[PDB]
C-alpha cells in the first residue's frame, strides 16, 4: 500500500499502543484493526520493556526532556535509531520511545506545577487567616496529636 | 551529545532483540 | 506561633503530604523533620476518608477540567468557599488534599495534550524518514499482527 | 448545580467529617 495511508493509521496505532501499554503497566477487544495492532505490539514485548525499564527511566531522566525541547531530542534520537537499519523491532522501539518520552516530559511538568500549587496554598493560608488560625493553636506541629 | 547517542543505542538493542524473537 | 512562620512551614508540610499521599496511593523510613512528619501524619490519618471521596472528586474535578492557565482562579474560588462557613483542622487537611488532587488533574490534562504532540512527532517522522514507506512496502500496519 | 460550588461543598463535609473523627 501507499505510505500516505500508513502515516494516517500510525496516529491510531500509537494511541492504542500508549493505551494498552499503560493499562498493563499499572494493572475486551479493540474496535478496529489499527487499534488491535497497537495492542498486539504492546503485549508482545511487555517482558522486554520491563527489562529495559530501569535503564530507559534513568537515561531519560538524564536527558530531562521538556515540552519546549522534546522535538529536538525526538528527531535526533529517532534518526540515530534508524541510521543503521530498519526492522519491525526498531519500529516498535520508536513507539515506546514516544510513550516514555511523553511520560518523562510530564514528570517534569507535575513536579514543576506542584510548586505552583504549593505557592497557591501558602499564599492563601497567609492572606486568608488560615495561617494565623493554626498559628494561634500551636503551629503545624499541633496537628501531630490528631489521631492519637 | 552522548546521552542522545546512548539512548538511541539502547533503542536499537531495544528493537533488534524484539525483532529477533518475533520477526 | 507567628503567622509568618506558619506560612513558611506550610510549603514543607504540603510537599510531604503530597509525597506520602502519593506513596500510599501507589502502594495501595521516617521523615527527617517535624513538618515532614506533620504532612505524613495528615496523609495517613485520613486515608480511608480520602478513598470514600475518591470517586466523587475524580469525577467532579474532571468536570472542572482545570488547566495550568485557569488553575489559580479555580483554587481561589474553591478555597474561599471551603472556609467561608468556618475553619477547623479537617478543612485545613481538605485544603491540602485539594492542592494534591488539583495538581493531578492539571497534568493528566497536560499529558493527554502532550501525547498528541508526540503523536504528531511519530507520524511526521515515519512519513519524512521512509519508515512509513518501509512498512507500506511490507503490507501496511496490519502486517505486524503476525508478530508473536 | 455549579461545579465550583459543588466542589467546595464536598471539601467541607470532607474536612468536617475528618475534624469530627480526629479533633
* C-alpha cell recorded at residue A90: 526498531
Residue A46: give its domain's CATH number: 1.10.437.10
Dist CA A123 CA A125 (whole Å): 6
Please tell me what resolution, in angstroms, this structure has.
2.5
The grid coordinates of residue A6 equal: 500508513
* B7 contacts A104 by C-beta, under 8 angstroms: no
Residue A46 assigned as binding residue: no
- Domain hosting residue A16, numbered range: 3-145
Which subunits sit against D, judged by 3+ Cβ pairs under 8 A? A, C
B and D make contact (3+ CB pairs below 8 Å): no
Classify the C-alpha dihedral A138-A139-A140-A141 as positive or negative.
negative
Domain count, chain C: 1
CA distances A89 to A41, A42, A64, B16, D10, Å, are: 10, 12, 25, 6, 49
Burial of C95 per CB tally in 10 Å (0-12, 13-18, 19+): buried
Secondary structure of residue A69 in the 3-state scheme: coil
For C145, residues 6+ apart whose C-beta sits below 8 A from its C-beta are A33, A36, A37, A40
What 8-state DSSP symbol labels residue C46? T
Experimentally, how was this structure solved? X-ray
Distances (CA, A) of D15 to A133, B11, C67, C70: 15, 49, 25, 25
The candidate with the shortest Cα–Cα distance to A142, out of B17, C1, C104, is C1
Which triple of cell numbers denotes residue C38? 506533620
Sequence length of chain A is 148
Closest CA to C122 of A5, A12, B7, A11: A11
Neighbours of C88 (CB within 10 A): 17
- Whether the CB of B20 is below 8 Å from some CB of chain C: the reply is no
- Closest-CA distance, B23 to chain C, in angstroms, reads 6
Query: How close are the terminal C-alpha atoms of chain A, in Å?
Result: 70
Q: Taking the CB of residue C68, how many other CB atoms lie within 10 A of it? A: 14
Measured between CA atoms, the residue of chain C closest to residue D11 is C94
DSSP conformational letter for A66: -
Q: Which residues contact A33 (CB under 8 A, 6 or more apart)?
A: C141, C142, C145
Measured from the Cβ of residue A19, the count of other Cβ atoms closer than 10 Å reads 16
CB D20 within 8 A of CB C93: no
Residue C60 contacts A where some CB pair is shorter than 8 Å: no
> How far apart are the CA of D13 and the nearest CA of chain C, in angstroms?
8
Amino acid at each position: 500500500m501507499s505510505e500516505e495511508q500508513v502515516a494516517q493509521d500510525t496516529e491510531e496505532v500509537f494511541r492504542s499502543y500508549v493505551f494498552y501499554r499503560h493499562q498493563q503497566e499499572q494493572e475486551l477487544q479493540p474496535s478496529s484493526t489499527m487499534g488491535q495492532v497497537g495492542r498486539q505490539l504492546a503485549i508482545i514485548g511487555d517482558d522486554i520493556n520491563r527489562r529495559y525499564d530501569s535503564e530507559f527511566q534513568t537515561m531519560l531522566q538524564h536527558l530531562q526532556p521538556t515540552a519546549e525541547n522534546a522535538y529536538e531530542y525526538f528527531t535526533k534520537i529517532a534518526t540515530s535509531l534508524f541510521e543503521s537499519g530498519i526492522n519491525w523491532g526498531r519500529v516498535v522501539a520508536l513507539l515506546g520511545f514516544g510513550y516514555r518520552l511523553a511520560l518523562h516530559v510530564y514528570q517534569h511538568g507535575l513536579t514543576g506545577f506542584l510548586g505552583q500549587v504549593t505557592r497557591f496554598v501558602v499564599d492563601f493560608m497567609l492572606h486568608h487567616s488560615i495561617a494565623r488560625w493554626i498559628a494561634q493553636r500551636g503551629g503545624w506541629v499541633a496537628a501531630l496529636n490528631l489521631g492519637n | 551529545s552522548r546521552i542522545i547517542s546512548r539512548i538511541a543505542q539502547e533503542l536499537r538493542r531495544x528493537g533488534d532483540e524484539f525483532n529477533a524473537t518475533y520477526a
